[PDB]
Amino acid sequence: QGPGSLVKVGTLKKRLDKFNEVVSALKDGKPEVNRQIKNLEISIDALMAKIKSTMMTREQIQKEYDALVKSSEDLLSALQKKKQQEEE
């Protein structure tokens, strides 16, 4: 038995940490970031526990991955406007 699809989930988790760093160097709009970044970290972690504690279909993981891509994508765009704004 092996991870298989879990690998993808872990990859995103890494992307999450990356956002934390970029956001850590911002110091602006922490509530909104830690809030979204939080539900996402939980989202990804949720799947993992679902992958080992349930026979989750790879298809379900693909879309869920998209759900993270949509929320994550918006986070970056939001961060950009944040840093460039230089004002909370």
Side-chain angles (χ1 to χ4, degrees):
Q1 282 262 85
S5 268
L6 275 140
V7 62
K8 297 110 175 114
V9 189
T11 329
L12 211 144
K13 187 104 129 143
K14 263 94 184 136
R15 304 261 190 70
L16 219 148
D17 267 287
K18 168 58 204 268
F19 308 140
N20 235 258
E21 184 159 320
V22 187
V23 182
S24 216
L26 284 178
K27 312 105 144 262
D28 48 45
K30 285 277 146 305
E32 59 194 289
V33 187
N34 57 39
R35 177 167 295 284
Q36 283 188 124
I37 298 203
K38 254 191 91 212
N39 59 43
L40 289 162
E41 232 262 329
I42 309 149
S43 169
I44 304 120
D45 207 274
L47 285 106
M48 209 122 310
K50 268 140 87 219
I51 331 303
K52 267 106 140 217
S53 207
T54 23
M55 261 203 180
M56 258 285 279
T57 316
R58 55 194 154 199
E59 272 184 320
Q60 293 275 21
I61 310 294
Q62 198 76 30
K63 233 258 269 149
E64 279 163 298
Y65 193 93
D66 252 76
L68 302 161
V69 182
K70 301 267 184 143
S71 217
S72 294
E73 275 292 273
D74 251 83
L75 171 145
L76 323 173
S77 312
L79 259 57
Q80 273 98 53
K81 68 157 164 59
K82 214 139 290 284
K83 38 238 258 265
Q84 64 118 311
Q85 267 176 76
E86 250 183 77
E87 286 200 341
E88 314 209 31

